[PDB]
Amino acid sequence: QEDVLAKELEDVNKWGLHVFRIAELSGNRPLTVIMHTIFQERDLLKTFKIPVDTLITYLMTLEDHYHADVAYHNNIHAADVVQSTHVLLSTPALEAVFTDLEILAAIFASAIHDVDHPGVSNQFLINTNSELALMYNDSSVLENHHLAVGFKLLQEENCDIFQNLTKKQRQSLRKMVIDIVLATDMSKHMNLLADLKTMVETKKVTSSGVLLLDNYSDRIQVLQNMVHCADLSNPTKPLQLYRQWTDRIMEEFFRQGDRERERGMEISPMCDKHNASVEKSQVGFIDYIVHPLWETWADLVHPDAQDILDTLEDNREWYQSTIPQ
Ligand SMILES: COc1ccc(C2=NN(C3CCN(c4nc(N)nc5ccccc45)CC3)C(=O)[C@@H]3CC=CC[C@H]23)cc1OC
Numbered sequence: 001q002e003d004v005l006a007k008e009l010e011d012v013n014k015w016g017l018h019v020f021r022i023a024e025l026s027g028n029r030p031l032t033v034i035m036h037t038i039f040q041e042r043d044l045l046k047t048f049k050i051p052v053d054t055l056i057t058y059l060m061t062l063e064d065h066y067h068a069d070v071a072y073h074n075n076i077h078a079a080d081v082v083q084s085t086h087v088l089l090s091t092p093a094l095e096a097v098f099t100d101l102e103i104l105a106a107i108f109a110s111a112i113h114d115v116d117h118p119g120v121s122n123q124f125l126i127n128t129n130s131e132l133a134l135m136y137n138d139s140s141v142l143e144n145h146h147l148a149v150g151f152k153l154l155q156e157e158n159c160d161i162f163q164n165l166t167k168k169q170r171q172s173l174r175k176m177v178i179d180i181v182l183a184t185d186m187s188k189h190m191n192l193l194a195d196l197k198t199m200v201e202t203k204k205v206t207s208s209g210v211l212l213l214d215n216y217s218d219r220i221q222v223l224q225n226m227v228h229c230a231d232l233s234n235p236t237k238p239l240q241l242y243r244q245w246t247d248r249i250m251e252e253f254f255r256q257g258d259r260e261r262e263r264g265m266e267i268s269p270m271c272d273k274h275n276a277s278v279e280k281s282q283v284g285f286i287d288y289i290v291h292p293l294w295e296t297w298a299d300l301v302h303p304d305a306q307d308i309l310d311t312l313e314d315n316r317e318w319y320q321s322t323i324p325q
């Protein structure tokens with residue numbers, strides 16, 4: 001192998017990279033190999049003076065804090081979200097829009113955004129009186145935790161990849177990362193999407209020209225939505241990848257359902273393996289969450305995302321066509 005891995009990683013800039021193959025070929029290190037590849041490609045190690053073995057140490061440590069016994073929310077998902085963010089950042093319509101620090105922030109935020117995920121929802125954590133829910137006052141419990149862990153890991157031996165940033169740089173980056181990860185909580189989705197829509201309309205009536213994001217609020221909003229799109233990108237991928245993501249999320253959700261049915265709590269939506277149509281849930285996920293978001297994103301970067309939207313629509317028809325009687 002290894003030479004085969006190098007060959008697969010040549011697809012790093014493409015939508016639809018075989019991320020599950022990369023995970024197999026790297027000894028279950030897709031996050032480390034993908035992040036390293038992206039960092040080298042974008043010359044981020046030179047730009048921010050990140051020593052290479054410090055980066056690798058951090059990445060291996062981060063990756064080890066993702067759980068391999070969690071079906072969906074593991075290191076492969078993290079890797080997928082990083083790589084997807086990387087491709088979105090390279091979309092023609094955003095060329096030269098974002099600084100190197102902003103790029104760094106978005107890619108870092110993607111890498112850490114689900115770290116130490118236990119495989120159960122915020123509502124489940126809240127309902128069981130978990131220590132995490134008690135620490136974070138039932139508010140974006142998981143996302144606050146992902147951030148805390150991602151930042152804390154920089155303190156392990158030879159893990160401080162930001163050692164060479166200036167203080168002002170660290171401060172800015174820290175704020176962006178926080179804003180970005182907290183925006184991955186689905187309770188924020190409707191407000192995020194409303195703002196994005198507003199921005200899109202504003203653009204249509206203001207300028208046929210290039211994108212102008214002149215204050216933090218608009219800039220961060222686009223970054224938030226970008227990583228949120230990457231987080232919600234499974235149904236936009238080649239169907240063979242999408243179906244594996246569907247298998248994984250349903251295994252995680254059904255396992256939460258099994259833990260909820262015992263203890264007599266309400267089974268969360270889509271978590272009842274005795275009463276659930278996987279295919280129907282995918283169509284609903286597309287119709288109510290993924291397509292409205294991606295259609296709006298596609299509008300912002302028109303026509304860069306047309307093929308992603310076409311894939312989404314074909315993928316929706318696939319699940320729609322296989323819904324049981
Ligand atoms: C003697 O002179 C060199 C010897 C080896 C390398 C090596 N470079 N690299 C990277 C290391 C991290 N980078 C930079 N980091 C930081 N903090 N500062 C930089 C300043 C200017 C350019 C790059 C960096 C990006 C490149 C490898 O990955 C090689 C393979 C394995 C180990 C080190 C090698 C570079 C040299 O001079 C630039």
Ligand SMILES: COc1ccc(C2=NN(C3CCN(c4nc(N)nc5ccccc45)CC3)C(=O)[C@@H]3CC=CC[C@H]23)cc1OC
Binds near residue numbers: 232234288
């Ligand atoms: C591959 O397939 C999926 C991948 C990820 C997720 C994810 N799902 N979600 C939620 C999304 C909205 N949900 C719905 N709830 C309620 N009451 N009603 C609904 C009606 C129609 C559609 C959805 C819902 C609950 C779960 C997360 O919170 C995950 C973590 C972060 C981002 C997305 C993840 C789902 C997938 O397929 C269903």
Ligand SMILES: [Mg+2]
Binds near residue numbers: 142
């Ligand atoms: Mg999450």
Ligand SMILES: [Zn+2]
Binds near residue numbers: 077081113114184231
């Ligand atoms: Zn995620």
